[PDB]
Design a protein around this ligand. Sequence first.
Ligand SMILES: *[C@@H]1O[C@H](CO)[C@@H](O[C@@H]2O[C@H](CO)[C@@H](O)[C@H](O)[C@H]2NC(C)=O)[C@H](O)[C@H]1NC(C)=O
Ligand SMILES: *[C@@H]1O[C@H](CO)[C@@H](O)[C@H](O)[C@H]1NC(C)=O
Lengths: 218, 109, 224, 149, 215, 215
Amino acid sequence: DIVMTQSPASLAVSLGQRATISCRASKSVSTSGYSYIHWYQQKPGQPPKLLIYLATNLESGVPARFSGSGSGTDFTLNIHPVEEEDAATYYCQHSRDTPYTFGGGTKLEIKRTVAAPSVFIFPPSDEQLKSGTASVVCLLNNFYPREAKVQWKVDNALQSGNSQESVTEQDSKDSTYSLSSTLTLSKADYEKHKVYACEVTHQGLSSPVTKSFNRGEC
Amino acid sequence: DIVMTQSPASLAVSLGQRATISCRASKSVSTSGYSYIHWYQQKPGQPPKLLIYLATNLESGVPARFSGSGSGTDFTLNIHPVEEEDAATYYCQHSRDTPYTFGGGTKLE
Amino acid sequence: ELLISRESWSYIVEKPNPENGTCYPGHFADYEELREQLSSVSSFERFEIFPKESSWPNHTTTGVSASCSHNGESSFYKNLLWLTGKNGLYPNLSKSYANNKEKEVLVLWGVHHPPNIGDQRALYHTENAYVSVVSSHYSRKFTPEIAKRPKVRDQEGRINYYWTLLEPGDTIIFEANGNLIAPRYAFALSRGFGSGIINSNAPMDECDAKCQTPQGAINSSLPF
Amino acid sequence: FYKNLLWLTGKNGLYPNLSKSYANNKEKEVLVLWGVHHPPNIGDQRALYHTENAYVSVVSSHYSRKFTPEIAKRPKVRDQEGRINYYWTLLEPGDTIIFEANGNLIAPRYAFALSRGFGSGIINSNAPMDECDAKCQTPQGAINSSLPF
Amino acid sequence: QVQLVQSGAEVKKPGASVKVSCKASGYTFTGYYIHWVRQAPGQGLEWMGWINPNTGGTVYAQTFQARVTMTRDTSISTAYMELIRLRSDDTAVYYCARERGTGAPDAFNIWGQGTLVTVSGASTKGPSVFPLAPSGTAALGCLVKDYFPEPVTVSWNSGALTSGVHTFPAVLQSSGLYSLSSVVTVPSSSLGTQTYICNVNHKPSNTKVDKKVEP
Amino acid sequence: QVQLVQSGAEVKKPGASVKVSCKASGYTFTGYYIHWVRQAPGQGLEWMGWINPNTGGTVYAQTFQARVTMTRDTSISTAYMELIRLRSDDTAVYYCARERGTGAPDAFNIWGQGTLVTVSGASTKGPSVFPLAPSGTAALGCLVKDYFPEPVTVSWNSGALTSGVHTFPAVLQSSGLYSLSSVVTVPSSSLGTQTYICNVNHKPSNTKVDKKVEP
Ligand SMILES: *[C@@H]1O[C@H](CO)[C@@H](O[C@@H]2O[C@H](CO)[C@@H](O)[C@H](O)[C@H]2NC(C)=O)[C@H](O)[C@H]1NC(C)=O
Ligand SMILES: *[C@@H]1O[C@H](CO)[C@@H](O)[C@H](O)[C@H]1NC(C)=O
């Protein structure tokens, strides 16, 4: 069983630069005059599409920005010039033997200037709790990079485990991100505390920033 | 060559009673966790239609009046309650080995 | 009935024309080579290499034939296993055994050559089955040969019996999509000089001797 | 890899059927070697030879044989899970040997033309050597003495 | 809907050959074996063989090994049985059956309408049909004589007289022809006042006949 | 045009079975192997096996040997993957891929749209959707709560408010349901004067909802 380790798991590159994704095998994938690596590109919500086959041969219809190099056990996908259209996930794969094993993935991010999120809080509407469960929301909007961390406070007391967050994909409008965090509670547990806050740690900030609201204050 | 003797050649049963058609093989039809008997119903002018397969398993769409029993070499098709719609010819068959041989028939009156 | 009860001896005694050998007809490969192997076996350990209960969860063990009947009931070999499909499947099996007993292990197995294609389709639900047996040196593949044959012991099929001495540390792998008579027990052999196989029908008492011969023992000082 | 053998593999995505032949015109029996790759899995074979159902046919005036590869995972001897079955034959003078294959052939690169000789032989031993000369030899050592026994 | 549909009934001369067709629908034709079965008239079933439409491989029964040829066109998911050197005792209903499941020798659950293959030395001679007139308090009837091939059909009063109507099945005469009788149980009082007419249709001869019956 | 097109997304109960279809077009279906691949949500690809549609032969990965069944109907150039005894971790996007070339283990160049197979114990419960009202100079939002199965879709002001719109993807709750949030970045001055309405559609439940949002 041939294992395709792949690195690095994510790239932060800027337009016009060079992106080098390095794939390695646990064993040689080269024989028959061929190296049986193949590099695919998968953008969100889409199937993959083949970029190069046999580790060097660009597929028809593909731009020449993509290039394949390497042999034996070590292979590389070089993109130059990087472009907005190249923001995707790039997978190694080998056809050398069964099982045909992929590489785990390499996300690719347009590198830009570090920007702090625009942060907000949305208290749970009365309709939330007319259904029997209230979820607080904390928004980070249009920030870069993505390594922002959020931690929940209620009555200045830490909140853990009762939370779920989701980030959107990089948006070509500015290549920044947005995160929506949520703290879910029962109407009872909602009532038994007063003030709700979300704290964020991010490179865009001088110091971690906490925003807050008080329950039902006009 | 496995021979499916079948009996009795004809039944005279009344509505609501029980009809028992007994099939026997010359050799075991049981293996693989299965008994390879199958019971079919053929009304006049029609093709057969499968009642039960593997000697116990009622086929989809079939009424539950039909039941399969037995194993090894001896098997039975039990109809209860008999009904007008059950006036037909009832055939044993084995899939155990080639040739797949039927049973000769059992008219029902 | 020697299985549970005997694992050691000084020599083996066989009758000239024993009738209770291969119950299900077939060719026992290298039978004579096996005899010569066992001549030097002073003892062994009959162990359940592949436990019937846990080794074959999804395969219908309890395949049985009349040709091997015992006390009137159809039965089968005890040191082997006649796998058969279950619930309409004979899923590919890949069981393995690593000889960690520090003694060469005698492994037995078999391939069912059924009399007709329907019989195979019934037992194994495939027309084109295969049996692959592999080790560090030993590699072999068996395809079943389907054909009507003379009806030995009222059976028209065959079982080809195969064996090998898996040496310590070696790993034996069975692969199959059908037609395997797998092992349930194997034998770990203890070699011994002086032992051997004697073909005869002479009786026994609980007399003790220094020498033995098929017609009888020898208890005397002479050289010749 | 071995030096007296050759591990053929496809090229440019093809493993075109080969039909190479040799006619022993050396006036000495020729020892020919070859091999068949039994790969560990079907993908490996498809990679090396681009066929799932390959064969190897080796023929001569008497010698005729056909090998099909047996694909199976196996114990990982020398870190290798496949096998190579090695075969040989003594192609006599004037005889012609033909190899045919759509895959899985470890073809010969070199063969051997044999010169038979009495008195020679094979000795199994680990004893050392010097540039001593002797009349007799044995695995433990040589013998240089007039005795009969 | 899953189904198999078979080529229409037909006749053949002894020594000739017949090709029956089984067109499948509603399922992956290649995945399920297909067997061919036959049933002699008024007799029991007997099994011919099967074909694996995926591979085209076949098995046939011994009493059919020499003469049967199963094939399949997978483009249109269709199977064929060709029987050659026909004898008379090969007249029968031939059915195409599909297995209930793959791989395991499961049962036949899908069947065909059945194709009636009739084998005898005749020339689709058309029926002659004659009254069976009553004379008192009794039923009435109509006879179909020495016709070929089956199937003929019979009715009364142009499809109105379904009461007490009995269409006996036909018998095969040593003459190589068929014959049967249609009958109607009736009250005697209306008889003689009412007018009854037997009628018959034999599509193979494209021949229809009417025949009044009276005391 | 060469292409593979796959059967639409679907749900299945744990312990049940699923059949995915890959219909080919524009090329000789039998000449190119067909592999099946899967991608767990937000995870990486993993390879199931292939089928040779010419022969119907198959290879599967070990972690899929026991449960996968690949087949093909060559009449309509179609392949099928059947996965049985589904577990929850088998929820994923299943793709059908075709090799770039024959014979040699070349790469996958034709892919399918991808079929989303979701495995969990729920009953396509419809979404409840509630405002996320602002109170000052900030953005606005809308929440979708405890709905199943995916995919739901959300928009704003009936398809006019595409500016600064952020449709966060959903998360799977321990409750066995999904939930997500739609948001819009806006200037605060127009807010309160302008009227904004979140809207949502969940085709599996045939359920659409509108929900106004205001300070
Ligand atoms: C074991 O051998 C016995 C005979 O020693 C077999 O039993 C029957 O023996 C009689 C003679 O005593 C024969 O005429 C029969 O033909 C034998 N049985 C059969 C079925 O042929 C017995 O079959 C043997 N069984 C095994 C498993 O070896
Ligand atoms: C055997 O089959 C059962 C059927 O439910 C399955 O749960 C189990 O994982 C299988 N085990 C093996 C070892 O195949």
